[model samples]
Target: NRIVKASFRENPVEERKLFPQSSCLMPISVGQAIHEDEKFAAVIKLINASFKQCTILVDDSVQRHTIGIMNHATTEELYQLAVKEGDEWLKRNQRFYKQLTIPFEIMRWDDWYNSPNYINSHLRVQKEYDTNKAFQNAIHANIDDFLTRYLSRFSPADVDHERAFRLCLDYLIEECSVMCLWTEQKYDFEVYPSGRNKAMAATYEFLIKPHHPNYLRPVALRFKKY
Candidate 1:
C-alpha cells in the first residue's frame, strides 16, 4: 500500500557531529505493525556497509538494546501477537516511553536529490575531497588501489588521483542523496515545496501517544527552525 521507500545514508559531517566517536546508522520508520517489520530487517542489512557492530537506531519499542528481532514469525497472525506483547511491555515501563523522541520526518528523497541544496552540498564535499591537503594526499597515496578496485566503473585513464577519489565520492554522495529522499523525508523544518511537505501528526498519535507523553510533539507540529 505504501509507495515511498526512501532510504537515507547519514551525511558524513552530520554523522560525525551526532556521534563523534561511534559509528551509527539511523533508520527512521513509522512503527512496528504487521507490515512494518521489514524496516528493522532492512536497517540491519544496511548496517553491514559499516564496520563491525555499528550502532543502529529505529522507531521500535522492543524493550531492550543490542537487539535482534524474532523474524520466524512473519505471518500476520504472529505479527499481531508480537505487537500486543511489545505494547504491553512498553505500557508497564513509563520512563522508557517518556524518553523516546518522535524520530525524523519523511521527505521526498528523489525530489531533494534534485534540489539545489543537495547539489551544492555534494559539490562542497567534492571540493574538500579534491583540495584538502591531508585528504587529497591520502587519496593519491591509495589511488592505485582505488583504481584497481573501481576500474570497471572508472577506467585507469582518469589519472588525476584526486579527481578519481572525488569521482568515487561523487558516486557515494549521489547514492546517499537518492536514498535520503526515498527512505526518509526531510524534517519539517527543512526547505521543500510546501505542497510536497506532508504532515504526520495523526500518524504519530496512532503510533506513540496515549503510551508516550503528549509533551513530545511530532516534528510536523513544530515551527520551522531555519
Candidate 2:
C-alpha cells in the first residue's frame, strides 16, 4: 500500500545540534493487520548524501547538518514518531532544545514527486552516466564504496580526524556550493526546497492527523514548541 521511502542520515552537525543519538523514528505498518505478531519488519535505510560534510549557519554560529529519512517505515508513522521522540528527548536534555528556535519541517512524498528541481537532479545524474546501464551500475558501486568509507569518518581513535573532515564539508558547502559535486557521484539525489517554510505543523494537523485515530484530540501531556 505504501509507495515511498525516505532516509535520514545522522551527521556530526546534528549531533552538535543535540539531535537524537539513535532510532531514526523507525515506524511501520502492514497496511492491514492479520492476527498475532502481525507487525511487519522492514529495512530502514538512510540516505547519507546530505550527511557527507554539510553545514548550516544559524545566526553567526556555523553548524554542520543533514536531512534524511528511514527506509523501513511508512512516512506517516515516521513523521509522527520523530516529532514525538525527538521532542521528548530534547526536552529532557532541556538546555539545548531551548536554544533552537527554528521550527523543524516534514514533507509529503507527493511534494517531492512533483518537484521539478527534484526531477531535474535525477535527469542530471542519469545524463552523467551517459545513459548506459552498465556504466551507471559501475558508477553506482564506486560511489557506494566511497560513501561507506566516508560514513566512518568518526571513530574513537580518529576523533580529531572526524572534526577536521566535517569542517571541510562545511567549507565546501558554504564556499563553493559543492553539494552538486557531492551528489553527481551518487547517481540520484535531490535537495528539498529550502528556506524558512514552517508548514509541517499545518500539514500534519490537516492532512496527517485525521488519519490517525489516537490523535483525535490534543493530549494535555504533549509539549508544544517551535
Candidate 3:
C-alpha cells in the first residue's frame, strides 16, 4: 500500500553523535585490581581524608566543596593490588610504581596519613593561592565542573574526594609557580623562581625540605646539580 506523503518538509533524523571529548571512561584493566583492592582503596582514602583535614586547617578561606572518598570499599580492608597486578603482568611495571609514588610517598597506612607534611604542603598551597590571584581564580571558576565530573565516577561514598581533589590542584598550582614544568614530568622537581629563566637549586632544595621525613636529606640534594 502506497500512501501520499505530506508536502516537502525537511525530515532529517538528528545524527547520533559520539560521546564528546569530555566523556569519562576508565580502562577495564585499570579497575580490575586498583578498583577492587581494599588496601589500595584504603591508602587512597586515608590520603584523601588527611589532605582535606589539613587543607581546611591551613586555609578555610574558600568553603571547599565536599569531595567524597572511596565507595567500593572501606579503608581497613587489606589486599595488595600492586602485587596482584604485578603477578598478572609478569613483573610490576615501572610505570605502575612510578604512578604510585608520583603523587604521595608510599608508607605504612597510618604514618603517611598522619604526616605533618600533608598540612605543610597545604599551607604552601594557601600561600601560593593568596599571592597568585589569576591562578586561583582560574581554578575557582572551573573547579566545580572538574569535581562534578570526577565525583560521578569515584562517587561520594566514604571519603572527602572533593577536598582531596582541591588540595592536589592547589599543590600542583603552587609547584607550577616555582618548579620547572618540564622537569616535573619525570617527577624530578627543580624550582625556577617566578620570571627566572634558570632553575634555582637553592629554592628547589628549600621548598622540598621537610617534604618527606625519610628522604629529607636525599631529596634535598636530588635536584641540587640541575
Candidate 4:
C-alpha cells in the first residue's frame, strides 16, 4: 500500500498535451532536487501547512502542467511521480523557477480577515471610510469591499504597481506599533502553534549527504524576507 502515487509512467510528452496549468515548487525543494531527483524524489512526507499535497502519479500520457495530487489523491497526490520520471524532460526549462524577492506580502483571504492582522489590515481603510456625512461629505459604503479594493493598489501588472501595493502593507505593519491600537486578545503568527514551523525536506542519500548544498539541510524551512 503506497501513499504517494506517481504519474507519467508511460508517455510524458502526451501528458503535457492534456493539462496546462501545472507544477510549482519553492526554491528549497528545487534546489535539493536539482542535483538529482534523489532527495525530493526518493522520500514521501507531507510538507505540512508549509504546503501542498499530491499523489505520485495517476496519469502517464499526461503532463501539461496541471501542476496539481495522490494516496486517495488530493493536493498530496499532485506531487507524486514528479521527481522520478523515467527519463526526465525539460531540465533546462524546468530548471528556471519563480523567485519573488520583494517587500510586502498578500496573505490568503482568511488570514487577512477577522483576526489580529485583520484589525491591523483595516486600520488605514477604516479611517479612510470614517467620514461625516452631515458635513457635505459622503460616508464610505460597503466597508469590506472598499477595504479590499483599496488594498489592491499594488496589483501585479507592472513593477510600479507591485511596489506600490506591497509597500502599503509594509507601512501598515509598522504603523500598528506606533499607532497604539489595542485590543484584549490579538491574533498573529503565533495563532497556530499547532501549525508547522517550516516546509519539510526529503529523500535518503541526498539528505544524508554531509554538507549537501542547497536547502536539503533541514526538515524545516520558512519563506520570508523580513
lDDT per model vs. reference: 0.33, 0.28, 0.30, 0.25
Which candidate has the highest TM-score of all? 3
Q: Judged by lDDT against the true structure, how good is candidate 3?
A: 0.30
Candidate 2, residue 157: lDDT: 59
Candidate 4 deviant stretches above 4 angstroms: 1-108, 120-158, 161-219, 222-226
State the TM-score for model 1: 0.26
Instruction: Tell me the lDDT of candidate 4.
Output: 0.25
Weakest ten-residue segment in model 2 by summed lDDT: 34-43
Model 3 lDDT-worst window of ten: 53-62
lDDT of 1 by residue, 43-138 (tens): 333333322223222223211110112123334554355345545434443333233232222222233455656665555444644565554444
TM-score, candidate 4, is 0.17
lDDT tens per residue, model 3, 117-174: 5455556655745775654565564455545654566546744755556554643443
lDDT tens digits by residue: candidate 2, 56-167: 1111111112111112355455445534543443344334223333332222222323344544544443453455455345444443443355445445453344544444
Write down the TM-score of every candidate. 0.26, 0.21, 0.27, 0.17
Question: Per-residue lDDT tens digits of candidate 4, residues 18-69?
Answer: 2222221221212123223322332221122122221121111111112220
Which candidate, 1 or 3, would have the higher lDDT against the true structure?
1
Which portions of model 3 show Cα errors greater than 4 Å? 1-113, 151-186, 189-226
